[PDB]
Design a protein around this ligand. Structure first.
Ligand SMILES: O=C(NC(=O)c1ccccc1)N[C@@H]1O[C@H](CO)[C@@H](O)[C@H](O)[C@H]1O
Ligand SMILES: O=C(NC(=O)c1ccccc1)N[C@@H]1O[C@H](CO)[C@@H](O)[C@H](O)[C@H]1O
Ligand SMILES: O=C(NC(=O)c1ccccc1)N[C@@H]1O[C@H](CO)[C@@H](O)[C@H](O)[C@H]1O
Ligand SMILES: O=C(NC(=O)c1ccccc1)N[C@@H]1O[C@H](CO)[C@@H](O)[C@H](O)[C@H]1O
Ligand SMILES: *Cc1c(COP(=O)(O)O)cnc(C)c1O
Ligand SMILES: *Cc1c(COP(=O)(O)O)cnc(C)c1O
Lengths: 817, 817
């Protein structure tokens, strides 16, 4: 049925009886009242049972061997569903498929019942999830640490073409994958004040909030390793949250417990602008304070000289969100352990490493000093001391460079004083990395130039990657099978072996097969679109898709302009042939991001005109993919023909969706941005659809001055589109509905959409020409898939391991379960 | 080892392997890191597995047979721990005892880890729990319906002799006994307004709150019947609690979900005064609205003529708390089902029955009309209509009795209009009952005289009872064994058979045995007092205990006066012999009940003086039992010698603790109040220590006028005590600390403590005389235990069943598991 593993006779029999066991004793049901949800749960429990054995030994192994431990701190872990992924890494997929079949059930139908663990916004969160999988697969003693939000990323509903946010109550029916561990609750402090007494500083009169951990198993690919992802939940103490006597009301006191537990209540959906809310700072300290106590406690056991701390501990900071870990490690070392400053700092720097994910200014965390002053007084004092000593180092290296001193400070003066968390991370980490070659170069040349000049050795690059298990074997078993048929299975944990596929580029059989799975994928998706969303699309057209969070820099708007152009060209010459296209755009907009929400409305408004024009027929379809999330990505990507990666050169740090499409047989049309540069470089520019300005062209335009009017004046096709928008062509009842978009495009477009319009349209024409030649299109596809091996997160993790953490990856199977 | 069941070789082997199974797959632990808590959980899960089979068939049986269903609605279910009770009703106690022994564990130690399900204040809540057990044991198709509070009754801490309330986070480590059932969530409405349109009224624009049920199994005694207790949890909808757009903040919207979920957050600890808070009214409608939908849905399946509704459904209201069930049944029948009023009312009255638990005015629920108007507009309209028609019935029966009309109204005029919920319950129920003969007579003669005259057939009596399984076999296995040794085991589900023990009253062997288990119980308790509370008491002294919630009417104060007298007599004649006594007083005070909290302080203040007076020696010890609750009651009661049931005649509706002591070998000193009257009547007044005024004497005193000064003037011993209190004898640092108590005792004592002082002290002297004669004391004990059969809740339930519900109890075993 596929290399989803063997379906042993004893294995299938055992699975079946354990499924019935759980349905009865665990769910307390019987085949006569069980709903598909109960069936999903019976199965999830049966599969989960196979992890326990390995989970306990893996952890036991690390205790005995005592290897260097890697701690990945992130406020986001975009996990998605875990049932199928678990069957895959455990080689149980076929056995479970058979067993459920015999019990008279459809496994695929049950898999659709599982909720997505949406504890992330997009790329940054999903990277942590791919990393956890690769770390387990490469046998590293790694732990994922984060917050267990009861509400993850909101569920997107489109109402009247507008995005509506709805709470994601993913825990409603329970999470069979987690294991609560109250025996490990830890106390986290907030507020209070600092007392300077004889022997050191003391943080007192603090408000206490408890951190209760929940452990989720992270199984490596067929190596019997099961690592742990520990997520903290906020809990109020039963005393003072009732004990601070002297009136107020007993009832009120217990009802007010929810104020402390609000910390882990919801994931912040803000993607673009840095708000600076107090609740968010709390979430950040909460995950940091609880995690470090856990890290140090585990170290103290190992095998009190903290000199060996960096030899046993590695802490990777996923962006600046968990940056408080630096001053928090110092506080503990200096205040509680009583280490001298200098010794404590040496230790801290040697164990911390920081990862940057963007260069846009509005996203940078710059916390008001008055907030840190009230909430974390001692940390502010430690940050000031860190700054003092750091600036003393700068002054000594660049004497008299008074301006460099203010540029490099961790403290920003002005309206309100703020602490630049990124500067804090650079000063307190022994390594700082970008997520793609071009991005890492930009960090050295621009944003962190002063820091690079001070300590060049700190800056590195670690190009992002995706996990081939979830992003190929799991979502595209068909494609995975035909590949395995020719080169074997070893590539699933060694993606570089995909290169061997280059020798089949002229294979008439392979070409036919590659083209066949893609057609099957498209038919399956086209069906799902009608089943769950009733719309109907032509599976013979080119599937043009751009799925990612809605941002001005991602330029979904540039895509919209192309779509309107196509429609206008058809209306001009109705009886001329054009390659049919089904362009799908999907993604969530941050709730307070007005422009982003205006763009979602435009997309649906275009579809309302285009999808009902009789002259267009089935030649052009504009579809907005509702509620884009991980489980939905697993469906669209394998079915896409054209992947849109059109950000303004220099704005997308790396991108990972782009790597997901390349691995699944879609061709890419994009700019020389982020990882796009390395993908084209791996597959050859001839096998890529590159267009638009390069980072340098954008700069040149900026020196000169970007004037949108110039393009409006010289391109009739562009002018016509803008007039359609202004006249209400796409919004009859509300003629001025899109005045904000037109206004922005013409007067304040930071992303030069117009500047790339002409080259983008022409490039899109070359894509349509190649699609007209099935054989050649597929041959190009084979060359993209065959050279995508570099983008596996196993490669990324092996580099972090070797160049940053100081640990050697191992593909050695753990001593059975 | 006892008639805790057989310990079969195959049974013990099976238990052991399943314990290891759960420890591994369920707890995800291994013998090397397991804590006693993990062990308790492994066992709880192993025991719980034996209920599933029976639970599913019992429910399946009721579906097929379709018997009349009994629904017990209560806002309180004081369950206590369920591990041991489950082993008892399943005859697994000895097998589990053996199995854990072989695994090298102490079962008793593990049992102590379980948390008490403290979803009740005291007697009313614990009665519901005893009733659920008896209903299962008598094979009735009964369901307990209530609210699943995440915080039950507060944990009492004594600080400086003062009571401190602390949140009871009983769900912290999880509840292995419940089974969440989200597939049965139901919507409950609040607020809104009423619309009168062509065909009937309509309740619109209501705020919606979801009710998610959690099912807990209620196993009958060795009959394989497992009934269900369904507890509702409040959940917010994910839409409007985020969907009511137009600014406010996305974050805020999801954080504000806690406002709707606050409904099931905490149990109201108010014992004495009726507050009338909005949150409480919500809790009451919430349990009523969700339960009725569930009841009707189950009826519609059965086997739409609601004419047969009362033949298939019986709804017992535990006090007026769930009284909204009456107008809510009408709303559904009239508004939704479209039945004519009269037909709907006939149905409602025939299915509802009401139980009264007190006659004190301050406890009666009288809801302000403005509250019902805002929160439940339609119900207010239905209540007014009910009142109209009812008063029309009264006017027709007593023409011209204009005053009877105002006395009987459900609507009370005055300062603020209120709805008298008790009047509502009488009008809408076919049966109204008191909980003890004297109490039921008082209801007819006083409080409900007008209603009794109108419909005499409605009023009944159903004297309370306690379950012999938990209150004998479970907490006093020793005593249960020696009884079984002589008369067999049949008495555990037929307590009347205890009468057979009368023929052993002169048995030298039995006398020695009865006296021996009590001494063993006292030594065990004396040890527990030092282990967990470090204090040290003499196990040879008389154990004088009064445990129950602190109320002025229970007169813990009358007890305190006796204690001070004893101490004063010893100080007067130090070298005179007196029967050593260890008087223990325990109970929680409602948080806002000032007087009650002042009484707790007095008790501890007395102990501070008495327990450290060298002249007193070990002759007198005053101990305050911290955090009195069900699990603690299971410990003290079996170890008590003297049970204090000294409420003012006419104030304690029934009492049940009194029945718990009688069954466990303690002698009773009390007034002719509540059930005390029937207990003395069953055992013979010669075998009881009765004293004080009878209900009539209290009345006579009231006509005359109660003047405390009179007693103060004529009793020197009493005068001396009051002067000790006023002078600061018991509060050196704060001489006037107890001025409020003295002031109340002298000028506003509604409970005539002084009036019963002299007779109480003299009676206490007769108790001390009998204790000096071991043989005779024990012989009297045998006569109390031998005549306590009447007080089993099986008898109570059999009467409710026959005289109110119209169903026949059955002791028939269900067809195996
Ligand atoms: O929540 C989990 N999770 C797991 O057992 C588990 C096992 C393997 C992998 C992931 C989760 N288990 C739960 O642990 C509580 C407390 O011990 C039990 O009462 C409950 O019945 C059980 O399902
Ligand atoms: O997704 C984010 N950032 C956020 O989601 C985010 C979350 C909270 C606050 C600010 C930004 N960054 C993304 O991280 C991925 C993985 O490195 C990159 O490939 C991508 O180019 C970048 O934009
Ligand atoms: O909470 C319970 N309770 C019981 O199974 C149970 C069984 C018999 C008697 C009382 C409770 N079970 C729980 O049900 C959830 C959802 O199906 C599972 O994910 C979880 O592992 C299981 O322990
Ligand atoms: O316990 C209560 N009442 C409350 O706890 C209560 C709870 C909420 C609001 C008001 C009273 N009543 C008690 O119910 C038992 C059982 O019928 C009687 O024996 C006892 O005499 C009576 O006082
Ligand atoms: C891969 C992924 C992302 C990241 O996509 P980009 O194109 O890098 O912005 C975002 N969301 C989901 C659901 C993903 O699977
Ligand atoms: C039995 C019981 C009660 C009721 O006692 P009374 O003496 O009737 O007031 C109260 N609390 C607990 C814990 C009980 O077990």
């Amino acid at each position: 049925i596929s290399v989803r593993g063997l379906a042993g006779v004893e294995n299938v029999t055992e699975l079946k009886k354990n499924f019935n066991r759980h349905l009865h004793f665990t769910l307390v049901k019987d085949r006569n009242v069980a709903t598909p949800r109960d069936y999903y749960f019976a199965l999830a429990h049966t599969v989960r049972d196979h992890l326990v054995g390995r989970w306990i030994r893996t952890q036991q192994h690390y205790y005995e061997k005592d290897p260097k431990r890697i701690y990945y701190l992130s406020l986001e872990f975009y996990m998605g569903r875990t049932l199928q992924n678990t069957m895959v890494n455990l080689a149980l997929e076929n056995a479970c498929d058979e067993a459920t079949y015999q019990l008279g059930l459809d496994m695929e139908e049950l898999e659709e019942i599982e909720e997505d663990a949406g504890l992330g916004n997009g790329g940054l969160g999903r990277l942590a999830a791919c990393f956890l999988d690769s770390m387990a697969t490469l046998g590293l003693a790694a732990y994922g640490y984060g917050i267990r939000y009861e509400f993850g990323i909101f569920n997107q509903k489109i109402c009247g073409g507008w995005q509506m946010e709805e709470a994601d109550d993913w825990l409603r029916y329970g999470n069979p994958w987690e294991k609560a561990r109250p025996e490990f609750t830890l106390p986290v402090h907030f507020y209070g004040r600092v007392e300077h007494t004889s022997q050191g500083a003391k943080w007192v009169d603090t408000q206490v909030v408890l951190a209760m951990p929940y452990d989720t198993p992270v199984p490596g690919y067929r190596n019997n390793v099961v690592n742990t992802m520990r997520l903290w939940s906020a809990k109020a103490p039963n005393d003072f949250n009732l004990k601070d006597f002297n009136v107020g009301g007993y009832i009120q006191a217990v009802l007010d417990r929810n104020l402390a537990e609000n910390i882990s209540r919801v994931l912040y959906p803000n993607d673009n602008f840095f708000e600076g809310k107090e609740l968010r700072l709390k979430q950040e300290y909460f995950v940091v304070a609880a995690t470090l106590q856990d890290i140090i406690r585990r170290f103290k056991s190992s095998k009190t000289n903290f000199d060996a701390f960096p030899d046993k501990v590695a802490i990777q900071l996923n962006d600046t969100h968990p940056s408080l870990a630096i001053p928090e490690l110092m506080r503990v070392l200096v205040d509680l352990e009583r280490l001298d400053w200098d010794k404590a700092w040496e230790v801290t720097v040697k164990t911390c490493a920081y990862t940057n994910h963007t260069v846009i200014p509005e996203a940078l965390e710059r916390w008001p000093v008055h907030l840190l002053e009230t909430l974390l007084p001692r940390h502010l004092q430690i940050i000031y001391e860190i700054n003092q000593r750091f600036l003393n180092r700068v002054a000594a290296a660049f004497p008299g460079d008074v301006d460099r001193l203010r540029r490099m400070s961790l403290v920003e003066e002005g309206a309100v004083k703020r602490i630049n968390m990124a500067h804090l991370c650079i000063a307190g980490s022994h390594a700082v990395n970008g997520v793609a070659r071009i991005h890492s170069e930009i960090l050295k040349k621009t944003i962190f130039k002063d820091f690079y000049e001070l300590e060049p050795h700190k800056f590195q690059n670690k190009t992002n990657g995706i996990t081939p298990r979830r992003w190929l074997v799991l979502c595209n078993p068909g494609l995975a099978e035909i590949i395995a048929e020719r080169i074997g299975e070893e590539y699933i944990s060694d993606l570089d072996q995909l290169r061997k596929l280059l020798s089949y580029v002229d294979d008439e059989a392979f070409i036919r097969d590659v083209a066949k799975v893609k057609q099957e994928n498209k038919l399956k998706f086209a069906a799902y679109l009608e089943r769950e969303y009733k719309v109907h699309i032509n599976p013979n057209s080119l599937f043009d898709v751009q799925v990612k969070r809605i941002h001005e820099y991602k330029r979904q708007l540039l895509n919209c302009l192309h779509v309107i152009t196509l429609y206008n060209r058809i209306k001009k010459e109705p009886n001329k042939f054009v390659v049919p296209r089904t362009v799908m755009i999907g993604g969530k907009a941050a709730p307070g991001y007005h422009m982003a929400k205006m763009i979602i409305k435009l997309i649906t408004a275009i579809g309302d005109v285009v999808n009902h024009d009789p002259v267009v027929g089935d030649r052009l379809r504009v579809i907005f993919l509702e509620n884009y999330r991980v489980s939905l990505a697993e469906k669209v990507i394998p079915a896409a023909d054209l992947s849109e990666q059109i950000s303004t050169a220099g704005t997308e740090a790396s991108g990972t969706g782009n790597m997901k499409f390349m691995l699944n047989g879609a061709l890419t049309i994009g700019t020389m941005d982020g990882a796009n540069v390395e993908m084209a470089e791996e597959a050859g520019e001839e096998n890529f659809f590159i267009f638009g300005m390069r980072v340098e062209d954008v700069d040149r335009l900026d020196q000169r001055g970007y004037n949108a009017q110039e393009y409006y004046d010289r391109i009739p096709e562009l002018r016509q589109i803008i007039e359609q928008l202004s006249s209400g062509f796409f919004s009859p009842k509300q003629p001025d509905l899109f005045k904000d978009i037109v206004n922005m495009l013409m007067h304040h477009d930071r992303f030069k959409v117009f500047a790339d319009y002409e080259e983008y349209v022409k490039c899109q024409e070359r894509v349509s020409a190649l699609y007209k030649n099935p054989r050649e299109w597929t041959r190009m596809v084979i060359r993209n898939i065959a050279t995508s091996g570099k983008f596996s997160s196993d490669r990324t993790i092996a580099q972090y391991a070797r160049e940053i953490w100081g640990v050697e990856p191992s593909r050695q199977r753990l001593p059975a379960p």
